[PDB]
Amino acid sequence: EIPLKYGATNEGKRQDPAMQKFRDNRLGAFIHWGLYAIPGGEWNGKVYGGAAEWLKSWAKVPADEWLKLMDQWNPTKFDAKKWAKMAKEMGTKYVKITTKHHEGFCLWPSKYTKYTVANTPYKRDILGELVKAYNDEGIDVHFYFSVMDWSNPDYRYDIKSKEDSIAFSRFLEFTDNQLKELATRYPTVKDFWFDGTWDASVKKNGWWTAHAEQMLKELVPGVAINSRLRADDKGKRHFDSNGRLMGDYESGYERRLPDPVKDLKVTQWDWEACMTIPENQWGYHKDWSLSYVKTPIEVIDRIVHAVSMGGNMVVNFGPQADGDFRPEEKAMATAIGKWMNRYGKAVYACDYAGFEKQDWGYYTRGKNDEVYMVVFNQPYSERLIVKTPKGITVEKATLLTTGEDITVVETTRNEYNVSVPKKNPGEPYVIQLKVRAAK
């Protein structure tokens, strides 16, 4: 044991109702919207292939010049009720919103900086309008917040002098002021998802990360806080020097989800994956031809994959500068929503089933011992192999959508063939099992 003052605080999963709600929600959307939506990956005639929200860095734009994009911020198509309707129809139970990205532009009218929505042609408190509209649809709101801030000259990437230490202290106070403002202006917030916490300056100030978590939990009863915020006494991030998870859930798995055979460890803690539709664009980029763009079934596979391993999945959107969504994103949301409306019983409030992984897809477990088979890969054998844990038997199989009884044949001591449906469903589909555990 390495002794720590700023390491993990929870032992095991939180089981208070707020955390149960965070978990049971399962499917979220992410909104990345900020000044980067205006250039959309292009600066002075060059389209950069890096993530659009990082364009200030790719194009080496000075802060004053980047922030003058505020003069063009006028999203006349924006309508928070329409955004909330889109999220509702997609089947999302929560939305995570960039309150302030690395650029430092605030989507709420902060009193601690001039680089906010208030000082644009549009003027309006976008964040506040979204909170109200999503909440009116019964959708929880989570806040993304970047610690690293390219607009504040007191930020430091490392501390190499007393002057650096004094500036950075002032920067942390500024950061606390904005966080307290968010927590109090928008008291229905359910989560803070921190980013921009990897620099040496932050790692040397792990105490601040623990303080931020505590401060926010005191202000917002039941709030969740991601692991990415947290550094311990030694600068170790996410999990402390004793291997214990910090914050309330592990944030990670953006590129690649946990392996269903080799990464079962993740079932021991809450976790949340966030995903882009293109390979690596979070903010609006005008050219999606530059990388692979996932199809709706590919996304749905990832959503179910996460739930099957006890995690949440969040699908990212990068709204246009005008305040509408691009056609690919409207199509995505609509397709997901159609599938979730049919099959969402196997997603919402579901978790890891404790069954050996099979090639046809994923198992999920409901709150009343329902075991769902979510089939993505249809066997030419017309048989879906089910190997049960010790003491577990399959009593019935039912096609979720129609109630069709599905034949179950015992093939060996711990294995069955569950028949595919009489008619190929033509899309990923669910068979619900009734199982019994030996007394």
Automatic annotation (TrEMBL):
EC number(s) recorded for this UniProt protein: 3.2.1.51
Biological process per Gene Ontology, one example term: fucose metabolic process
SUPFAM superfamilies: (Trans)glycosidases
Keyword presence, Signal: yes
Site (May be important for catalysis): 274
Domain annotation Glycoside hydrolase family 29 N-terminal: ranges: 1-345
Family annotation (InterPro entries): FUC_metazoa-typ, GH, Glyco_hydro_29, Glyco_hydro_29_N, Glyco_hydro_b
Keywords in alphabetical order: Glycosidase, Hydrolase, Signal
Protein's UniProt keywords contain Signal: yes
Function: Alpha-L-fucosidase is responsible for hydrolyzing the alpha-1,6-linked fucose joined to the reducing-end N-acetylglucosamine of the carbohydrate moieties of glycoproteins.
Name of the protein: alpha-L-fucosidase
Pfam families according to UniProt: Alpha_L_fucos (PF01120)
Family assignment from sequence similarity: Belongs to the glycosyl hydrolase 29 family.
GO annotations of cellular component type: lysosome
Top-level lineage group: Bacteria
Molecular function (Gene Ontology), one example: alpha-L-fucosidase activity
Species of provenance: Bacteroides thetaiotaomicron (strain ATCC 29148 / DSM 2079 / JCM 5827 / CCUG 10774 / NCTC 10582 / VPI-5482 / E50)
